[model samples]
Target: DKDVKYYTLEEIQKHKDSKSTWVILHHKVYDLTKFLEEHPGGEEVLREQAGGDATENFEDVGHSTDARELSKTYIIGELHPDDRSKIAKPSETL
Candidate 1:
């Protein structure tokens, strides 16, 4: 709603690390690095999708509102509109 920063996959690609991991969900970007070691599924599941879209993988898990609430903390911003052009929509996964 305000001045939001948008990131490209190329830029996003640079962040997938045990120390600097990132991922996308419905075009929203998340830096999982800070939360990496705190994941319930471990870093394995999170790193697998680092630097790419995780919308489909996440949707398959039947995530709850609480899970989504946690998502808000990690959100740096959304993917660029150019990058988002290739992705699909979320059922209010926003």
Candidate 2:
């Protein structure tokens, strides 16, 4: 079984630069600073959403299966329960 880590919104917001960047996706936090240079969309794109939840933004772009699989490498922790509700949910089916 995987040992899941947890983090608060405030903690995730601290790493918003090239030295240490993080983004939330599906309630999980990912440190993408080291991966920025390899991002297909370019580092600036990821930097634009740093220290913020990027679930919807990522889904909107229709990330590929490979991209989804690759993201696991950066999985650092899950968002704390109190912070999960802050993420907006879709109002209706597409």
Candidate 3:
């Protein structure tokens, strides 16, 4: 098993305006508000992590389903990017 990290809707919103962080939902843009400050990796990393679709990160249908439901909370705000940790492989390729 793998330990993956992700931000909740409330958490991500905390950093919504951070230039260092971003979120892309179905081609649209979003700012990761709360997440930026608490992002253990720091805000800078979010810019790269959120710029595109992270479909490859998914590990199971349940996770994807949860994300779909989570999106509803954003409502008028921007949608969130897919969970990044889901896509990470155990090894790197050349």
**lDDT, candidates in the order shown:** 0.62, 0.64, 0.43
CA lDDT, candidate 1, residue 4? 49
Candidate 1 collision pairs = none
**Per-residue alpha-carbon lDDT of candidate 2 for residues 7-72, written as tens digits (9 for 90 to 100):** 887887676564656766667777776766665555445435646643555533434665554567
lDDT of 3 by residue, 37-66 (tens): 544555544325545555554222333434
lDDT: the better of candidates 1 and 3 = 1
TM-score each candidate: 0.57, 0.57, 0.31
Off by over 4 Å in 1: 1-3, 40-68, 86-94
| Per-residue lDDT over 1-94 for candidate 1, one digit per residue giving the tens place of the 0 to 100 score | 4444788778877754547557566677777666666665655354365465434455324345555546666778788887668556667766
